[model samples]
Target chain A: DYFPVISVDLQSGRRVVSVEYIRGDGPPRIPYSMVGPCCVFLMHHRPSHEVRLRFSDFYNVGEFPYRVGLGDFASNVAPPPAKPFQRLIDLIGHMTLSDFTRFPNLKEAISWPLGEPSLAFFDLSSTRVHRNDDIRRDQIATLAMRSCKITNDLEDSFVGLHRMIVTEAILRGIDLCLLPGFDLMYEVAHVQCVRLLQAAKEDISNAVVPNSALIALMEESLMLRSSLPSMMGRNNWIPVVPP
Target chain B: DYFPVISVDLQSGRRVVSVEYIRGDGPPRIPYSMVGPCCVFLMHHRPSHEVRLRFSDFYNVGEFPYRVGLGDFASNVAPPPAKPFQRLIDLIGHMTLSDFTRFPNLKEAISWPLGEPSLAFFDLSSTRVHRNDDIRRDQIATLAMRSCKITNDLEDSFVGLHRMIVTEAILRGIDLCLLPGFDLMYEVAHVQCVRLLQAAKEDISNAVVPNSALIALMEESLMLRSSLPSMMGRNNWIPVVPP
Candidate 1:
């Protein structure tokens, strides 16, 4: 058996017919375990078209053509999606449903919530760049609300590597000129975070300044808000894609 | 009955004494109310080096000559000491206490815990006089933090006030190139007397910016291990009491 796939065009509301091939039952031509969308490159046909698939079909192993449903992917050979990593992707993305970049670590830290990931390509330092473009000081504070450390001797041990840098990147967004309210917003966020930390039996005294990523994001957003081309307005945030 | 009052001299630790007289009762004798180690002036005297009583003994209060211990002046009567006003003096002298003058209100804002006037005498309009002196644009923000207004809002308010003729009175202690932090301290104090208003909750959302009062305080206080100065290092900022 070969495989099954569908092709669709955006401009013209049309769909080419589906394809399915089955091999003789010697060692099973197509793996029966595959249960996700598949992709096929028909090299034999003239003017070949790219074919995509559905979750019910056998999955392939290769780069997906386009994002399918949440956590599902299209591949060349049906490879079982890592169960934990797939579930993690779903849960992590939901942590910041509205603004992921604002937290600076939303992508990297939550990449493999269920602990299966070498596929994620995230670096928290980029938040510094994003902060300069898309965030404000106060908004950045909001992002790092739960992760921030107080200015002192203690480090936030619970915070993961992904979480720390992402928060810092977000904080890099705020402009110094408009950063007047940073301490206030930060104070508000910090008070709440400390309470949470205390509830978890954590010592809050002598904590280090924690919310860099959030602050960077906030600064970037606010800075960009003023610099946006009149046509774009505010809704220009890029959505995240699952690996 | 007459009262006795005494003042202790700083030059010499000796008590300068006074006696009081009763109303419509007798000669200029000690009034029962003037028996305390109270602040008073020398009015009249006896040949035996004992002071005579007059109406002037009660007015123009100053330093006390003696420190009473455990009901030393319980029987004597004198004008009441201004304990409430003394709180204000402490507030004026607060260079180390971060909580000093950290009011949400300019005037009658805090009523409980201690019934003292927490005021800011500096006018919002007056901040503009130091605009030219802002080398780093930090003072504007510093004033905003202390005044509990946003830098932009304060800047806007100040720009409007700068139209008025800045008098020598407004420019009293502020000099060109003085530390903006010190200027903010002095200016905020001046805002309390004019147009008295009660303190309100601070709207921190809009107040953040460079040169904001709170930011300046944070910056300056954070820099050194422990050196919070009242003067701008360059300008003299002794409290506006009589020399």
Candidate 2:
């Protein structure tokens, strides 16, 4: 089938697409039984395309051009036209990050206030990365807000993951600043991902000092400033994926 | 069948204890199609027993001896045995309100600080009561909090109600101080209801300022003090009725 296998399985268990193909560019296709819709993927699309890639009609398993959906590849297979993940190819061309190297300028643009809390809060000893077993699906799981732990599942595809570093440090809250997949998710959303970081600081300050906002911005920026320690440290987040 | 009717209907449509029986002291019934468990009743228990009373097996319609559940009636009809509403009978006897007259003394105990905003904010023209048509059931409906429009229904059966006088005044915030049924909901929980008032003030201060509590308590207690205006003024809330 030229179509991206909306799914995949082990050759021993079953196969057309290799494990790499199903995880095309998003989290492994939400298990076939869990397959929802392309819209949901946009709601949670990581750069990794969820659909399989089909290069040609000859092989059943080819790279699905769209990570999310559209076209004949989508007509019968998807409810709506599929949307591709913000591809590496796109990043290579016209996009803003200009390329992954954008990280340096973004980091350079970040100015620190005196008395950085990151260094103060630093010492990987204080916070613990939650085991995959501890993650709970909470209402706060949308963009603009997240309370630590989003880094644990780097593939969730929401802007939330872009915020893992700041959130984990201020959790009320973890050390997940430099979690491996950080750059990749940022590459996908670029400038907007930074906004998620800004909005998250606002959300936390409310929870952080629901008591006061006079210091909300002050405390907010300070946390963001110091959050570099968390970013500098590797996330204790253990990844859980296709075995 | 000396069981309290968990529900009721119009007399031309049905009969028994009479309208007085269905509305015993609480709001009208939630209706048969909406029949939920006693626990849910406990969750939404309004003093007027939802259960119908049975003066005798002779007439199936009797004042339900127990409002919520538990007893011979519960044995056959309830899953875990019903629990009763805090009975008015209890208020008549061993209860704290000592009687309906508790309002005067309770009001006397309320202390107000200077700079009465109640008078300052008083302007019947600024706010308008919401007609029954406009009310939307929101998540904020719970103990220790209420944002205006609560007095409109008068029969929900939660600690939230006793607070109508104060809350309607400070809703984010209305004037519902002198609304008719305030004394009734308060009579049910009394001391605890007062605490709900305290907690409600705290909840509002945060939502009110979300920016600072430096003035949270000052503002909180002040709102509570001036809240009498909202209490003094009848709620603009128009009632929904059985007709």
Worst 10 residues of 1 chain B by lDDT: B234-243
Q: Relative to the unseen true structure, what is the C-alpha lDDT of residue B7 in candidate 2, on a scale of 0 to 100? A: 20
**Candidate 2 residue lDDT tens string, A63-180:** 1223222222432122212112123123222322222222222221121110011111111111222322111112112111111111122123222222222222222112222222
Candidate 1 per-residue lDDT over residues A1-243, each given as its tens digit: 333222212222421122232233345432122211222232211211134332112111212222222224333222222221122222222333233323222432232221112111121111112333113322222222222211110011011111222221112221112111112222222222222222211111223233443333334334534774221121111122222
After superposition, candidate 2 runs with Cα above 4 Å error? A1-243, B1-67, B75-149, B154-243
Tell me the lDDT of model 2 at A215: 33
lDDT of 1 by residue, B59-152 (tens): 1121111211124332211222211122232333332222423433322322210123432222212323333322212333332222221112
RMSD of each: 31.3, 25.9
Q: What lDDT score goes with residue A44 in model 2?
A: 23
* Model-by-model DockQ, in order: 0.01, 0.02
Scored against the native two-chain complex, candidate 1 gets a DockQ of 0.01
Model 1, residue A13: C-alpha shift (Å): 78
